[PDB]
Amino acid sequence: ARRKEFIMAELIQTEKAYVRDLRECMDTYLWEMTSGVEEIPPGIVNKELIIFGNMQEIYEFHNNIFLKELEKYEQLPEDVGHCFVTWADKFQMYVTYCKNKPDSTQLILEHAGSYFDEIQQRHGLANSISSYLIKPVQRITKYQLLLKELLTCCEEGKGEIKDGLEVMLSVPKRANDAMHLSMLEGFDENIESQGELILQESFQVWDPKTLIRKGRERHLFLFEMSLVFSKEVKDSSGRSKYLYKSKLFTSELGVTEHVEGDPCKFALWVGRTPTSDNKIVLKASSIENKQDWIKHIREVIQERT
């Protein structure tokens, strides 16, 4: 219980430091951009929303809700996992922040010049803007680290510690999934209408529709309402994009786990009956990847039927 106390105390102390840091970042760098009288390099003029992402939304969540929620567990460390599960929906704002991070970094690197560095020097600030902008990303990692530490000294399956850790691990994962989704080209359909993106991954796929039947690489996006097939292609400089190919409705999906001759293969079909004209065979990169997809596909099929 001594190690648990050190962890809980650090969780709360660093939460206070985090809230203070976001506040200072907005009161200095952000304020200067929105109310300052300094020359803003045209490349970043009034583009604060891109530079700072939704930092204000994140600050309000921790300052109005999360620190207070964590403090309720100041003397109940083994049960703090519940906080993360309970407020999981709020943590979706971190997916938004992390998704935007690459753009912010680039807008600064190519159009900011020494604008922020000069603000730092003139105001005698300890933290550079880059040091502040990475804090929300680092905060999710810190939560993962603290929850993992609690797992080493808590009863298996209690206090939602593992469930809370999973919420924290899913955040960077969903941000990465969204980055790949942003590479999909040619899907002329509302993305929001597909429901939430659950998984995205590359597979070797055998299609009954191609002129020549063979395993071809395809990058799949499993949404709550549909499974989208796309093909990764690269341009001259090696930049990848995914060309939209087709889409199956999850409510109509059927899955076959075992395919003779390759433990990494599984099959999908649509409608009541599988036929040589509708059966798709997929080869995953590993048995673990195959099992994860089978699990999630079975889940969307169950939800939609």
UniProtKB/Swiss-Prot annotation:
Changing T141A: 80% decrease in nucleotide exchange activity. Changing H180R: In MRD44; decreased activation of RAC1-mediated signaling; severely decreased neurite outgrowth. It is found in: Cytoplasm; Cell projection. Widely expressed, with highest levels in heart, skeletal muscle, and brain. This is Triple functional domain protein. Changing D79V: Found in patient with severe intellectual disability; uncertain significance. The N-terminal DBL/GEF domain specifically catalyzes nucleotide exchange for RAC1, leading to the activation of Jun kinase and the production of membrane ruffles. The second DBL/GEF domain is an exchange factor for rhoa and induces the formation of stress fibers. Belongs to the protein kinase superfamily. CAMK Ser/Thr protein kinase family.
